[PDB]
Amino acid sequence: SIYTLGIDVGSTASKCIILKDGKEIVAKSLVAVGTGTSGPARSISEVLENAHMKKEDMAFTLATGYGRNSLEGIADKQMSELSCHAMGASFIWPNVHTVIDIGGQDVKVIHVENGTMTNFQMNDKCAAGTGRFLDVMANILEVKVSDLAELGAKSTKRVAISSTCTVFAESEVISQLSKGTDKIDIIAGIHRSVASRVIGLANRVGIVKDVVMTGGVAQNYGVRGALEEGLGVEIKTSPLAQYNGALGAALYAYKKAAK
Amino acid sequence: SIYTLGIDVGSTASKCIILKDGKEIVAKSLVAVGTGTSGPARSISEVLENAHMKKEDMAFTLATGYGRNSLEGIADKQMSELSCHAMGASFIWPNVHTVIDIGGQDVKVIHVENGTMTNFQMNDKCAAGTGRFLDVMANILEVKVSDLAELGAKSTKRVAISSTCTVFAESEVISQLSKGTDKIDIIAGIHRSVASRVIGLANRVGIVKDVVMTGGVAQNYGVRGALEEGLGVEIKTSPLAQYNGALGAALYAYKKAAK
Ligand SMILES: Nc1ncnc2c1ncn2[C@@H]1O[C@H](COP(=O)(O)OP(=O)(O)O)[C@@H](O)[C@H]1O
Ligand SMILES: Nc1ncnc2c1ncn2[C@@H]1O[C@H](COP(=O)(O)OP(=O)(O)O)[C@@H](O)[C@H]1O
Ligand code: SF4
Secondary structure: OEEEEEEOOOEEEEEEEEEEEEEEEEEEEEEEEEOOOOOHHHOOOOHHHHHHHOHHHHHHHEEEEEOOOOOOOOOOOOHHHHHHHHHHHHHHHOOEEEEEEEEEEEEEEEEEOOOEEEEEEEEEOOOOOOOOHHHHHHHHHHOOOOOOHHHOOOOOOOOOOOOHHHHHHHHHHHHHHOOOOHHHHHHHHHHHHHHHHHHHHOOOOOOOOOEEEEEEHHHHHHHHHHHHHHHHEEOOOOOHHHHHHHHHHHHHHHHHHOO | OOOEEEEOOOOOOEEEEEEEEEEEEEEEEHHHHHHOHHHHHHHHHHHHHHOOOHHEEEEEEEEEEEOOOHOOOOEEEOOOHHHHHHHHHHHOOOOOOOEEEEOEEEEEEEEEEOOEEEEEEEOOOOOOHHHHHHHHHHHHOOOOOOOOHHHOOOOOOOOOOOOHHHHHHHHHHHHHOOOOHHHHHHHHHHHHHHHHHHHHHHHHOOOOOOEEOOOOHHHHHHHHHHHHHHHHHOEEEEHHHHHHHHHHHHHHHHHHEEE
């Protein structure tokens, strides 16, 4: 009976979630964020449509993300991206305590307790370990970022990328091609390279029980598997992975719409 | 009467120096890293020719640089790049105490005392502040790395690049173009951006009196000027700037050839 709207406006995309009584997801949406493109707005329409409801049907609207204020007038209230991820993770996995969120342009590991963000470490300046790292690599390899996972899974040889930087690592990848190294192998290498950076931030926080991966890159099971190897613990993820930030907002909305 | 050979084999180029009695430069050479694995070799021939002498005439040969361990057989002893720069700087500027060396793929600030490396700070992992940063920018701007200095000198408006990263700053530059911002201005901005990183390392060491800029990027007076503004002290440089590492090797050679 009470419908709420969670809006996660990131730097790459804008995700939306609408849930009934804060217990079930009725609809979600995702729209690329282009300059001028007005995609966060579009995504809102997208959800409302998918759900067959009007903005006036939402009890409370909560926005989060990089441009969580670009639609200030839309959201009743805005909230930290760390908070929503913690809240959302908790809705999907009750025993979460550690949340690894990789999105374009940034990474962040969050320690969660009672759907809240206890502590966290995040990278906002280095393109390394971000989905942007994976883009720059998929381009040189001439492959689709959403294929990397599938390809790297075929690797038979370990190929390391000693360069920590995206720029230097780019040359490495180019050079590994000059040596006739297979792409499948270079990819699995790029994945461990990303895992390595995440693991780097990860340790300043500590991997607690029931680790979950969130964000768009979450889909890349190549990357996630590289993470399980590094941290040596199960890394969980679900289809809703990239809609976590939004899901968190919707949960905080339904909460604000009860107090 | 005693001729020595200094060979600085970098990642970008291979420089060579030959001096008589460790007091005067008789000849120098510079050869890129074209595909072949004989550019360092080629440069040696180049110098010997320019000088009109043969490898035998060289009393002692000392190699330095990224591929130092590659001239084992050609050279007689190898030495730290920090040491040669300090030694070489001292030969060019007696009162040096601080040496800023920007080359492709790395930056490093050296404190010098009696032709020796007292302390130093260096960047080897981040492409930011390196000549590689300038490359990635010259490409997007569609200009020649050796023109940047000349162009930026015409800027009339200050345009900042808030991004510290080469990858993110790359997009910025692209975006500053979308806003119709002049290249001349974007360049001067890129220069200060580089200066900022150098100054970053610089402070962990301390700018002492008589600062000198070394390395290929040394030529870029756009960059060097950005450095004088930041540190607020004179930054010296000479034509031999990029041959400093080699010059240092030749000086250590003539020294080894006297003890
Ligand atoms: N199928 C896929 N496989 C791999 N990566 C993907 C896939 N779909 C999206 N991604 C990526 O995951 C990231 C998700 O970004 P996201 O978290 O939505 O961005 P932001 O934090 O800016 O909102 C991007 O780098 C995007 O390209
Ligand atoms: N005329 C020039 N103007 C600006 N930059 C230059 C010029 N000539 C060379 N450079 C650059 O200066 C740097 C010199 O690199 P160098 O110190 O020789 O490399 P390495 O440290 O790998 O041996 C490179 O980034 C190169 O492109
Ligand atoms: S290490 Fe590379 S990817 Fe990271 S901030 Fe530096 S230039 Fe950017």
